[PDB]
Structure 1
Amino acid sequence: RGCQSKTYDGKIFPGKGGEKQWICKDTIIHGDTNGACIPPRTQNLCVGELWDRSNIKNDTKELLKEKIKNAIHKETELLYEYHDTGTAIISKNDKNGLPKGFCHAVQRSFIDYKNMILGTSVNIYEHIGKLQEDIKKIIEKGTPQQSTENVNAWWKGIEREMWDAVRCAITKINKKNNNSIFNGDECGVSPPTGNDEDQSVSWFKEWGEQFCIERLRYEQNIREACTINGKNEKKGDKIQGACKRKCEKYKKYISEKKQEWDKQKTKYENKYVGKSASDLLKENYPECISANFDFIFNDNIEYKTYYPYGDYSSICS
């Protein structure tokens, strides 16, 4: 049942809206994994074979494995379409001849599958949930007794194969264009690892890439509306028409993103002592280089007065 074209950042043209939004949950004690804000992509994860209610209550680990593989293959195929058509927010920016943001999206969904199966899934997500309980039962009955350790070992034992589903799907795309010859290793010869394993970090990094890309889109729109003629617009007396409109859209945007930033920044910096949320985003995404997060999301009252449009207050005046 299902696993259709993605819609998490809006439907693919001629499709209208249907976009999903980041869902932030109050993070209590976090000793193992978690994650503060759930990505729209994660909410659109192709589960189908696994769930819709669990559909693996009485399956064997071998059949569980084939379903996971099928889900991963389809997810990769669907994400390719979503970024290729330039519908995903992170694909809009610029563009092997892989669509912009596609590899990052696939890596993130792979990590989401891993965490959903290991039971170490950040915020107990509605659709999945009880799915993890049945996984543990299937594994416990299907493997030699030495419970969370057995599921972990099982995943490690099949991880290479699951990643090959991604590589295989990438090569299967070689039925479309001859602009590039995909060998399947474009998104990495091995699955994501390191800090990317921690779903909390993966989600925050995704939030940051999207945020920075949208910020640049607002900047371009602002520049086109506030800087023609020779220089001025709404410098003069106050902010005029088109320039004010674009600047106001940005102010509104930052206002909405502030809550998401605070929660993720706090969770990340408290778990990774010494490391800064700003560095994490700037070291990973080119789009975040020009973003001064501390300035953009400053809580001072003097800030909203002196800089009504945040970091773009000078272009907006």
Structure 2
Amino acid sequence: KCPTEEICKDFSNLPQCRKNWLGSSVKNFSSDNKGVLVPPRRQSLCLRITLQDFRTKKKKEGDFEKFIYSYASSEARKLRTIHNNNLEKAHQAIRYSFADIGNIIRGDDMMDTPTSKETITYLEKVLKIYNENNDKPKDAKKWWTENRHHVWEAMMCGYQSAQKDNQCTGYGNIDDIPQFLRWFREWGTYVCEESEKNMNTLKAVCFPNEMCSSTLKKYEEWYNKRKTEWTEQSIKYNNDKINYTDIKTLSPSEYLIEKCPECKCTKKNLQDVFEL
């Protein structure tokens, strides 16, 4: 279920958080991460910790952590405000941001930004200050393992404040899925949806004069835009799949067709369209 009303009170919103696929501003975009496209949701993710945030929040035990929780809660609220007429898109976007918050905290998020580079260093310094003589986490990896449940509660409390939803959810194991795969999947959820809709539209108009020709022209523009992105992301997918025993023999289309339950990608709307 949703978390108790008590737990939610302990979290707070941040007015900093208000409401395409980018092939740059990724670390090592020409080497390790060639082919990686950053989701628009990630580019817009509400979480920034500055040297100055570190200075203020470190002064009281637990405040820096709560500052993180607050951002996570605001990110969730924002996402449900964006996807207000669609519960499940909202849920999946929250999950994706939750996982992204994980990589940021753990210091291996792919975006080349100060927040992505610096958050781990600030968290770990604070944990040294307060936990160096007890049994509590002193590194960000253990912190995440021990506190990810709290982070998720803050997101659900956030999601509920958008429009008093009573339908919360768990996060599956989303945060354990390699980030490049999650981004590829999220691309998948947008594109396979476009693809199914665009096909129906094309068939309907062209195969029940100029409207057909006009429809096909737009269908082509959509196709070429996504085809470049498909091509880029397949480079990363194919380079890195060798390291995972259960996808190493799968093509990029097979990955999204067979191993992305949120995707709705099919042979007809993905494989037949994008892979010749």
Q: Give the TM interval when normalised to the shorter protein.
A: 0.7 to 0.9
1:225 and 2:194 matched: no
In structure 2, the residue matched to 1:287 is 264
In structure 1, the residue matched to 2:212 is 243
Stretches (4+) displaced over 6 A:
none
Q: What percentage of aligned pairs have identical amino acids?
A: 23
User: Which secondary structure does the structure 2 equivalent of 1:133 belong to?
Assistant: helix
RMSD: 2.9
Taking the TM superposition and a 5 Å limit, the aligned residue runs for 1:64-75 are 64-75=64-75
TM-score, normalised to structure 1, is: 0.67
User: Which secondary structure does the structure 2 equivalent of 1:120 belong to?
Assistant: coil
Alpha-carbon deviation of 1:259?
Answer: 2.2
Letter in 2 for 1:56: D
In structure 1, the residue matched to 2:21 is 22
- Contact 1:35-1:203 at 8 Å conserved across structures: no
In structure 2, the residue matched to 1:311 is none
Distance 1:42-1:161 versus aligned 2 partners, 3 A rule: same
Distance in 2 separating the partners of 1:195 and 1:66? 20
Alpha-carbon deviation of 1:269?
Answer: 2.8
Letter in 2 for 1:108: Y
**Aligned equivalent of 2:239, options 270, 275, 293:** 270
Distance in 1 separating the partners of 2:23 and 2:150? 33
Alpha-carbon deviation of 1:42?
Answer: 0.6
- Contact 2:83-2:90 at 8 Å conserved across structures: yes
User: Which secondary structure does the structure 1 equivalent of 2:117 belong to?
Assistant: coil
In structure 1, the residue matched to 2:182 is 202
User: Which secondary structure does the structure 1 equivalent of 2:180 belong to?
Assistant: helix
**Aligned equivalent of 1:2, options 10, 16, 23:** 16
Report the count of equivalent residues.
245
Q: Which one has a bigger Cα radius of gyration? A: 1
- Structure 2 portions without partners, runs of 5+: 1-14, 242-247
In structure 1, the residue matched to 2:143 is 154
Distance in 2 separating the partners of 1:115 and 1:297? 30
Distance in 2 separating the partners of 1:264 and 1:224? 31
Alpha-carbon deviation of 1:292?
Answer: 5.7
- Structure 1 portions without partners, runs of 5+: 7-20, 86-94, 176-180, 229-239, 304-317
Distance in 2 separating the partners of 1:35 and 1:285? 22
Alpha-carbon deviation of 1:208?
Answer: 0.6
Identify the structure with the greater helix proportion: 2
Letter in 1 for 2:54: K
1:123 and 2:118 matched: no
In structure 2, the residue matched to 1:165 is 154
- Contact 1:195-1:201 at 8 Å conserved across structures: no
- Contact 1:170-1:183 at 8 Å conserved across structures: no
1:135 and 2:123 matched: yes
- Contact 1:83-1:101 at 8 Å conserved across structures: yes
